[PDB]
Amino acid sequence: SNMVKIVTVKTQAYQDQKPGTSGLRKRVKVFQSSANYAENFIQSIISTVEPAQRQEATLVVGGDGRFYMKEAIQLIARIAAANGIGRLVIGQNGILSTPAVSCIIRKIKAIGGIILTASHNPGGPNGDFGIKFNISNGGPAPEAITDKIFQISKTIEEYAVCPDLKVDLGVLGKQQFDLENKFKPFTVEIVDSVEAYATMLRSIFDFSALKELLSGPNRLKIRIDAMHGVVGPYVKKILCEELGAPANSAVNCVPLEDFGGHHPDPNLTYAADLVETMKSGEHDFGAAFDGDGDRNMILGKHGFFVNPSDSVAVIAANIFSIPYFQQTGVRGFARSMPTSGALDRVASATKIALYETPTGWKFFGNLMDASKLSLCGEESFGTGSDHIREKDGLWAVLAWLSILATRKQSVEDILKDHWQKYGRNFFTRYDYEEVEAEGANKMMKDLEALMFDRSFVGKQFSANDKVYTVEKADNFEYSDPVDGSISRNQGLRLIFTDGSRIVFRLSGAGATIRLYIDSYEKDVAKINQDPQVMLAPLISIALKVSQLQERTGRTAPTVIT
């Protein structure tokens, strides 16, 4: 049973297996009840690897612990073996965070990896499942490759598999499989889920300083909520065991196949338990992660919310608290276009390039590969650096802890100081979910026509007393300086002379309108007011100029962040 046979299985192609930018995601039920659905897709991935290069290739494999993960990993082993892939490196119990996969790929020079995650989407018998493909730079497979995978998947007629091959995912070390009538063996290395990632962080951060910060009587008190997802053992082994945080610091840090029956998506309501804990006033710092660990929410004492747009700005403004950046220097900053302009204030002051990209990883990855990007952020709870090629939630937490250690102030005092220094970008995102597509499309088309008129620049909007003047209005376009691609229709931007912006996007069962409001204030009498009060005038202007209520019938957003 260490010696196994290779067989060819006739199959019937499916027509909807698009790998997308974040992976193929379907209901678990779909993978289970659709004959050869997973097999087809995994074969299609492996078929993108040239036969001549398969024996010397390694794929990194692991996922976020959700229901069906281990069955999918076994299936990946069976098919990779049969196809002549020489080696898989698999996290113990199948567990690898998305940042750990990126880490390991780059460390061992793997050709890529397959990540079993659907990120922040629910899991369990009635939940979702996802299959994500990363390539040799440790980042998401780009469109040319996902296109090829899709094309193969649509006409596949057979796949190769070792049906009797079974991996013990629970035990560390090398397992070898001899394939019938194949000269070279198939090798699986089970590795500790945390070690490589922790060794990376140990080099990036000053663990001595952090241990001192987190240990003993005068310690910074923290609560870190992995939301029953993949980052749990990382918190326990790094923050608690290595850096000495009391075990109670690790909240929901046992991976559960259904993430405890909840969505592992960090925000004020999905992580309401963490927020309520922080409200007691006993802890200095709180954070929550999404299911696969590339998203993070940051909280201060009393449940003070650091919005993600501000978070990346504060990290930029204190970036040399982190040993990694002392060594590399700061190669550049970037944020997605709908993210608030807080980062740009820091970049301008420190005279570092600011790249404003369309939504999507590929734009950050390109700039990092060009040695032009050290720190990036997205308003959707995303923060990262060029240490790897995925965003990294726990990395962002250790960045914050490093800054707290050097500043010796509370989270809230650091933000107040920041706002006083740079001005404040009040920020919110309104989501209108499942709106009728016809109305939403008409809303966008009509608004863009309005904005394109010659007289629209210079138009004034009263608040009142306060007057907003349109400086620039367009449909965002981006020419990538690395791959030369031009991305068009990336969002309607109303840019005002006082540094403020309104941005409209349609999401990529009914459309989702995303409305981003970025209101800049410099006045001391304004920067510490209530955010929804300070944002109300631009929100009003946004709804009036777009006629959103009139076009969609919505009097209120579905979600406010």
Q: Is 309 annotated as a binding residue?
A: no
- The residue annotated as part of the active site, out of 22, 119, 309, 340, is 119
Taking the complex as a whole, how short is the minimal distance between the CB of residue 120 and Mg ion, in angstroms? 6
Regarding 378 and contact with Mg ion (CB under 5 A), the answer is: no
Query: Which one of 259-267, 284-292, 347-355, 373-381 is the stretch in contact with Mg ion (CB under 5 A)?
Result: 284-292
Q: Is 119 annotated as a binding residue?
A: yes
Q: Is 350 annotated as a binding residue?
A: no
Rounded to 10 deg, the angle between the 393-407 and 98-108 helix axes is: 90
Query: Which one of 87-95, 157-165, 288-296, 413-421 is the stretch in contact with Mg ion (CB under 5 A)?
Result: 288-296
Taking the complex as a whole, how short is the minimal distance between the CB of residue 383 and Mg ion, in angstroms? 12
Regarding 292 and contact with Mg ion (CB under 5 A), the answer is: yes
Q: Is 292 annotated as a binding residue?
A: yes
CA distances (Å), 242 to each of 15, 401, 478, in order?
48, 15, 43
Residue closer to Mg ion by CB (options 294, 344) is 294
Three-class secondary structure of residue 164 per DSSP: coil
Taking the complex as a whole, how short is the minimal distance between the CB of residue 264 and Mg ion, in angstroms? 9
Contact 345, 339 (CB under 8 A): no
Residues pairing with 478 in the sheet: 487
Contact 264, 229 (CB under 8 A): yes
Q: Is 119 an active-site residue?
A: yes
Residue with tokens 């900053």: 333
Residue among 225, 265, 284, 294 that touches Mg ion (CB under 5 A): 294
Taking the complex as a whole, how short is the minimal distance between the CB of residue 71 and Mg ion, in angstroms? 21
Q: Exposure pattern of 479-496 as b/e (b: 16+ CB <10 Å)?
A: eeeeeeeebeebbbbbbb
CA nearest to 393, candidates 288, 303, 318: 288
The CB density around residue 87, as the number of other CB atoms within 10 Å, is 21
Query: Which one of 118-126, 365-373, 440-448, 508-516 is the stretch in contact with Mg ion (CB under 5 A)?
Result: 118-126
Euclidean distance between CA atoms 18 and 41, whole angstroms: 9
Regarding 290 and contact with Mg ion (CB under 5 A), the answer is: yes
Q: Is 518 annotated as a binding residue?
A: no
Regarding 380 and contact with Mg ion (CB under 5 A), the answer is: no
405, with CB counted inside 10 A (0-12, 13-18, 19+), is: middle
Query: Which one of 43-51, 112-120, 372-380, 396-404 is the stretch in contact with Mg ion (CB under 5 A)?
Result: 112-120
Q: Is 25 annotated as a binding residue?
A: yes
Euclidean distance between CA atoms 557 and 194, whole angstroms: 40
Regarding 64 and contact with Mg ion (CB under 5 A), the answer is: no
Query: Distance between alpha carbon 257 and the CA centroid of its chain, in Å?
Result: 20
Regarding 379 and contact with Mg ion (CB under 5 A), the answer is: no
Residue closer to Mg ion by CB (options 292, 310) is 292
Residue closer to Mg ion by CB (options 113, 439) is 113
Regarding 119 and contact with Mg ion (CB under 5 A), the answer is: yes
Query: Which one of 115-123, 232-240, 410-418, 479-487 is the stretch in contact with Mg ion (CB under 5 A)?
Result: 115-123
Taking the complex as a whole, how short is the minimal distance between the CB of residue 98 and Mg ion, in angstroms? 6
Q: What does the DSSP 8-state code read for residue 110?
A: -
For the chain, helix, strand, coil in percent to 5 are 35, 25, 35
Residue closer to Mg ion by CB (options 83, 380) is 380
Q: Is 380 annotated as a binding residue?
A: yes
Residues pairing with 430 in the sheet: 515, 560
Q: Exposure pattern of 284-302 as b/e (b: 16+ CB <10 Å)?
A: bbbbbbbbbbbbbbbbbbe
Residue closer to Mg ion by CB (options 292, 344) is 292
Q: Is 180 annotated as a binding residue?
A: no
Residue closer to Mg ion by CB (options 23, 537) is 23
Instruction: Count the residues of the shown chain that bind Mg ion, applying the rule CB under 5 A.
Output: 5
Give catalytic residue positions.
119
Residue ranges of the binding site for Mg(2+): 119, 290, 292, 294
Q: Which residues bind Mg ion (CB under 5 A)?
A: 119, 290, 292, 294-295
